[PDB]
Amino acid sequence: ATLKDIGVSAGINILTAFIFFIIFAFLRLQPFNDRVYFSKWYLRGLRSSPASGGGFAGRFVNLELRSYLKFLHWMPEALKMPERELIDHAGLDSVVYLRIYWLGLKIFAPIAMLAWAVLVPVNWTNNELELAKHFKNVTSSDIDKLTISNIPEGSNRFWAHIIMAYAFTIWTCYMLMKEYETVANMRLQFLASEGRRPDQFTVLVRNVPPDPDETVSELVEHFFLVNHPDNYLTHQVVCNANKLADLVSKKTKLQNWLDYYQLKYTRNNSQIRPITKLGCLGLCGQKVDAIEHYIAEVDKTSKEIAEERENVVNDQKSVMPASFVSFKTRWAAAVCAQTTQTRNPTEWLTEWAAEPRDIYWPNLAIPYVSLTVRRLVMNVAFFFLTFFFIIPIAFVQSLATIEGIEKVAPFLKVIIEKDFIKSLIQGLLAGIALKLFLIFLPAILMTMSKFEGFTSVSFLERRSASRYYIFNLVNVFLGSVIAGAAFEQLNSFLNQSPNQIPKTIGMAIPMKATFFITYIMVDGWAGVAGEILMLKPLIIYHLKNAFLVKTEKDREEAMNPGSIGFNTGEPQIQLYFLLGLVYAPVTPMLLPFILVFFALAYVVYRHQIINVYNQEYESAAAFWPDVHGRVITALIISQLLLMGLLGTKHAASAAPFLIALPVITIGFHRFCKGRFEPAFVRYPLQEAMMKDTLERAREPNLNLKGYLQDAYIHPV
Amino acid sequence: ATLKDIGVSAGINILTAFIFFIIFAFLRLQPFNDRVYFSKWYLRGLRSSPASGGGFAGRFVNLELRSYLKFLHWMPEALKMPERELIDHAGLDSVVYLRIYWLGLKIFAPIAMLAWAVLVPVNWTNNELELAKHFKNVTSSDIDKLTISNIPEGSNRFWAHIIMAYAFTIWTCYMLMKEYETVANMRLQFLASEGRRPDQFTVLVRNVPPDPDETVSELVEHFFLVNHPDNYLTHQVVCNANKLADLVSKKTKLQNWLDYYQLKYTRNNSQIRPITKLGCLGLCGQKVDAIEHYIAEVDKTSKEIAEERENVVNDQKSVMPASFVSFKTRWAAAVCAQTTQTRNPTEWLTEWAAEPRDIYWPNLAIPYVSLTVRRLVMNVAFFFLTFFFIIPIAFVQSLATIEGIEKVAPFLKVIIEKDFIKSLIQGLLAGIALKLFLIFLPAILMTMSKFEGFTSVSFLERRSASRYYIFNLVNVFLGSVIAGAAFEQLNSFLNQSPNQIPKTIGMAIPMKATFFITYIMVDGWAGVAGEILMLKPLIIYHLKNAFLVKTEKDREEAMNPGSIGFNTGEPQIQLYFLLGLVYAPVTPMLLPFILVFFALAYVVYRHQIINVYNQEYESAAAFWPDVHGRVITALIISQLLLMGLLGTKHAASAAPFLIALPVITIGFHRFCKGRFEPAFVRYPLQEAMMKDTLERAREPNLNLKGYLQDAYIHPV
Ligand SMILES: CCCCCCCCCCCCCC(=O)OC[C@@H](O)COP(=O)(O)OCC[N+](C)(C)C
Ligand SMILES: CCCCCCCCCCCCCC(=O)OC[C@@H](O)COP(=O)(O)OCC[N+](C)(C)C
């Protein structure tokens, strides 16, 4: 895995990224895409059509004379928009995400320089890995002599590792507190200048207590007109368009899926009959005939739709025990969100409402007790997923440590591991397998967050990211560590005795570092570079437009871009931060790769937040408190592991120092928490009065009951 | 320590309590005390003077013909006032304290019956304590064969212990949740009917941010008139009047002191000259001469006392960055206490104010940063006190395990521990020594709570009780356990080998139980019975009245009773609950003694809450959340210790069951918490509006700015 495998992976990966960048140039210079690659410039009313208004080309005939402007330009230009002109083109959230990448860089760049110098020198001048291969059968290479494991048991050269660790934790923590403050100040300034949104005045009251002679709405009016007497303006109840909406949706699906097999070439048409109960399928069946999904799955749907409408809207059997109450001021609404209203701690429970567009309406109609049982069931499913994944994870770790599995088992083999280009290619293949598994993980975890019952689309994402973190941690990190350890040094474990289990464990942790390096390379580099091409979103449009088009004009738009994830992306940045801290005080060579990822990523994503991407909710940066927490967790795990390894190499004249480390970390956490979290979780009342008195001097007229009344209704 | 020592202690203690009760009868039938023994009947305007209006006797001449009405009566009668006529004679707090004693009884009575039956039988039919004295030198008696230690290693009779443990934890937890609800409902109903107090409308704002052109009061008016615009009525600033307060104090001391040395017999008088720098003293010195602290001292103090009044009432150098703001409604004030006011999380910080009489004004004039450093310094002092106490604690535990210290050291000895009445008397003496040390502890801990900076006299008490708990736990319990263990089985530890350290530890835990029994007896029984006599408060009055009297009439009153403590008392109840749980699943014989304490105590204290005692603040039961927590802690420690002992006797076919136990305990804690703590820590807004709308219909006129303006001023 020495320089050979690292170089092969690196060559292949840099090549993949350059090929990507070339195909992207090509595809972004053809004027039939355009609305796929420059969509927030069109969805902001600022770009018109193909060739500056369209009607023209720029396609393939000469297409492109050679260019070094095949890259670079996108690069520098993404770099040049001030960061305050980006808060208003894009939003605060996007800007705070790019900030995460830059904090990474900060921390790590300094740590890397230092590490390298001090520690590589120390570790390299020191002999104890050649002696264990010759007297204890521990397999190793020459990339392993810049690690904490070429160092003899018996210190005096372990103190470097401890001092460096201290330096590193202090730097990380300082940098992290400075970012907390910036992000807080920014949030507050944004919040003070954003224009009316309907949720700066509304709350969601959940658990209105039942009665037998008053409706839900005659009980919500009477409570707030007696208890919040001067500022109360209106309310809107919660009902079940769950079924009504399901039918409107089936109708849309039928019409799409059949105005297709309707204007196929015009005229009378064909047939199909897929088995329809799970997914995919086609022609395996009996539902022949034709057009409009027999225009009549078309019209039966429409009739059920009208009847459902009726029942719902006329029945107080479909009103849920909850409402959305609005007030005349933003000061009054912030007092109903942070105050207790009744003596029963579970009834009448106010919070702040989300913006009417970050509401997942399908879970506003789920009872409250169910909420608790559901949460439990989902925690159980999580534990089981964690176990099945351990299975696929070791499968991967057996392809990566194959040259040691083929020593205590000189059996099947890649022609007995000769033909050495093949084994480096095996390091690359291990990477690709883990990639695959982890894709479907993101989607499953979102489905499990939408069951436990949340009702904002921004909290479902935050939850999903937290769960990915846990999964990632355990599984990837530790599973890989454990299994890889097993295999190579399994060879060594058989032909020795059960004490050497520990020492062998220490050295194997540093080798798993080397595998992590390769994975970073694949994932990081190539993925950030292949994200620039938007390929599912490009096929998707072109198929769409030469199939289900029949556009009235061009007003029929199906370009919709997407949004950063929060989910996928944050989970990745965090895995890489963990890796980095841990390996900084052990193998100081994962750092250069971590850094290339952070920089490319910042450049690609600024481009995609500026040209493509559009945000679907605005919660001025709350995930910050969450991100900070996850970095503090990494720091603690790192520190505990260094203690462990230092114990395995018998150095007791240094581990209490490592203990002070952990305590200093938790103390800084607590400080930060205090100050800045207050900023992110509680709306001051002086801030709500200043926004409110400056808008009643500018718009001295304003009727708020027009605007706020119907903003929280549904598909009605 | 068998039946012999237990019986001697019990006889002597029951005798002491009966002698006490007799002397109390005597002293409560003489009509010169009366105002010492029936003071809340005089301080409520309901009793007049000595013999029904006084002027008469009932003293010593025939004094008392023999009576069996020498006791009993106080007993039944304390029992007969409904518990709702006691909420208004006395207050809610006192009633909730007596409830603690009754919960004790509940839990333990059931647990005791069960224990006894099942476990004593099981443990007694079983041989393994006679075999270890004959083959491992473990000293023991015959009271030890009803303990978990006459049971052979190897279970099948340890399962009883585990089942019983489960039963016991469930019962405790059920009982505890039912009390939570009662106490919560009671608090809420009280709070809804109590008449105006000035703090139902006021808050304390601490940390008003400095300026260079506006005073503290022109900055508190402007903030609340712009930010809480409609309900704001008044404010009163905080000034350091620590020095004037101190000189008024020195003046009263001088006059009292020496209007005494003045009317000694009238005329020209004597002299004195104590060393005056630390305390006590008399005649060792030079300050001779004459009457009322050389009346010139009394006037030089009244010079400073009028020129301190000027440099304090007109300066703005003695105004502290804080105020007390009042509002026109109780709904408005509860919104300022539970809401954030500014973006700087450390400035402008509102809470609810205490009643103007539960304010410790001396610490309202301490800066805020100091508050944090002070807290740290006091935590350090706590750790050191804990260590010195370990020293006196083992001294005590060496007098209690003397018959085993005099085996591996047949030396000095009580005439070689013969004369056996003497060694039982040593069990009683150990008890008395611990009593002594622990007295001065209560007072020290209060002094340390008044340094860390609190400003209510009710929180200083709560803090002091929590600290006593920790001290008690560690020191008493564990120190005693450890040291006692050491001594007896030290004998056994020398003449064996360092593996038998563990097994010997198990058996010694059960013997320390027996010593705890004796301490309970002394402390509990005799102390509750000697508390009925109020002897420092009786001497104190009689000296006072035949010395510093010269009463204008009788209006000069110096009877002041006191108040329950909260401090001392709660700390005791909790030590006994701990002991009980722990020993219930091990030595099932501490329980009968625990119970006698709980019952006597309830009877004596009801008497003293009904006749003597008067409350100095009213915080309708908040210490409840605190008490509950401490009982949950006991449950957890108990459970962990049973696991330990069961491990020491090699029973692995039962300890995971013990683990489930701990988790079930924390779950019930969390439920309770949720519901009822909300009740005790947050004032609902529907409750404040109902109190406010029913008082504006009864007293339709009411000016609140008269009443609320000057309630928060000082010695001015
Ligand atoms: C993630 C870690 C969390 C907390 C970290 C502390 C846990 C680890 C601390 C100790 C780890 C290893 C402890 C250690 O001491 O290992 C046991 C060694 O002493 C065993 O040495 P041996 O080679 O068996 O010595 C005997 C050799 N003959 C066999 C005596 C030659
Ligand atoms: C407060 C407790 C917190 C948690 C509770 C768990 C901690 C205690 C759990 C184990 C306690 C004792 C554990 C135990 O296993 O003791 C060690 C014994 O196995 C020693 O047995 P020995 O008599 O040394 O056996 C060897 C005998 N020769 C010497 C082999 C005869």
Numbering used by the authors:
A (entry chain A), B (entry chain B): 2 to 717
Question: What does the paper behind this entry write?
Answer:
Here we determine the structures of plant and mammalian OSCA/TMEM63 proteins, allowing us to identify essential elements for mechanotransduction and propose roles for putative bound lipids in OSCA/TMEM63 mechanosensation.
Then we solved the AtOSCA1.1 channel structure in the lipid nanodisc environment at 2.5 Å resolution. As the putative lyso-lipid in the central cavity may regulate the channel activity, we refer to it as a ‘modulating’ lipid.
